[PDB]
């Protein structure tokens, strides 16, 4: 009773304070700073897929090992998403993002030099664990600096760094891997081929992300929700002063005076760990309370269905391209095709960012899901590699709008004291669906071209149906 009233008052006052601060230099600097973390998350998905064909002959892989290297990144991202999303509600957004990026960068650096298959798999697993928490923490962290006026557009513009990271990965694979002449020996005991240089170069975005992130302040909403008034006041005054100084009005004074707020060594560390686990578990369970159970279940359905369909069909596409190429042949390309498939997403990002607030999150989500379903139904008519590439571009362009709308909706539908926990849980569910869909859609190749299409169409139709029952979030303060 009392706590809900106090949190609603805090939300209203925080909206008023952010409207006083305005949107300007500070928020765009933070946008570009967190774009580096999103870009690292984008690159991680492509690294192993690009390097596997060259690693198979250096580490002597069986096919099952290649598949397990295919699935390790998603497993690690699931675990890391849940872990870091849960922790970010207790330790803070900035600190947990720093720890996540540090783990990711360290183990990505290690994976470039380790020799055996098992150690490389372990290093990639831990790199995925590290970077798994980037999207839940980044989106909430950035949202906690945004007023409601253009919140949807500002959050939608954040999704374009993932595409930029995909482009970076494709370009660097194009530029580095083919050049086998770059290979050398790191001592006479070990040879060091170019794909390891590619693996190393894919770690730079996260290092730059750490460097840029160290300069930014912690989210003031976290401090206010944790009873730390003075720190939140200093952070908000920094925001206001930066915005006004950049706008040519340094004479303005931050008028806020008081903000509502809510309130042996190894043995001590054990107590700390148990208490942190208890609090994270409490947040996770409260995500399923009577106030949010329906929202949580509908979001689980939407996330799982669309992730499963998208990842399964995006793995199915290259397999069909290979099959048609082989059928024709029996009578740079990989990187270039990946680059085209990545650039096919840009129009979707632009349109979704420009229409998110004009037509709302629900219409975006449902219409994009419907278009994805019909573009899936179209895939039965493919007849050539160029046709399959074109349909892949169509599907990828139409689904990224669904993804952006889902991200914004997930940000807006949960309270600040559970936002990262819920986002991490749903993203781990997304990665679990990715694993399951990749496996199932891999099982179908060569046997039929109808079953995976029917699966994806049904899943996307179910997701579109669920997208219409979620509530509107425009015109509401950031709860």
Residue numbers in the entry: 139 to 401, 415 to 482, 595 to 742
What do the study authors state?
The synaptic vesicle glycoprotein 2A (SV2A), a member of the major facilitator superfamily (MFS), is a key target for antiseizure medications and a biomarker for synaptic density imaging. Although its endogenous substrate and transport function remain elusive, SV2A is a target for clinical antiseizure drugs such as levetiracetam and brivaracetam.
We replaced 140 residues from the predicted disordered N-terminus of SV2A with a maltose-binding protein (MBP) tag (SV2AEM). We tested the function of SV2AEM by measuring the competition between unlabeled compounds and 3H-UCB-J. SV2AEM exhibited binding responses to levetiracetam, UCB-J, and padsevonil comparable to those of wild-type SV2A, indicating that the construct modification does not impair drug binding. We reconstituted purified SV2AEM protein into saposin nanoparticles and formed complexes with an MBP-specific DARPin30 to further increase the particle size for cryo-EM. We determined the structure of SV2AEM in the absence of ligands at 2.8 Å resolution. The transmembrane core and three short intracellular helices (ICH0–2) were well resolved. In contrast, the luminal domain was discernible in the 2D classification and unsharpened map, but lacked high-resolution features, likely due to its intrinsic flexibility. A central cavity lies at the interface between the N- and C-domains and is exposed to the luminal side of the synaptic vesicle, indicating that SV2A adopts a lumen-open conformation in the apo state, consistent with previous reports.
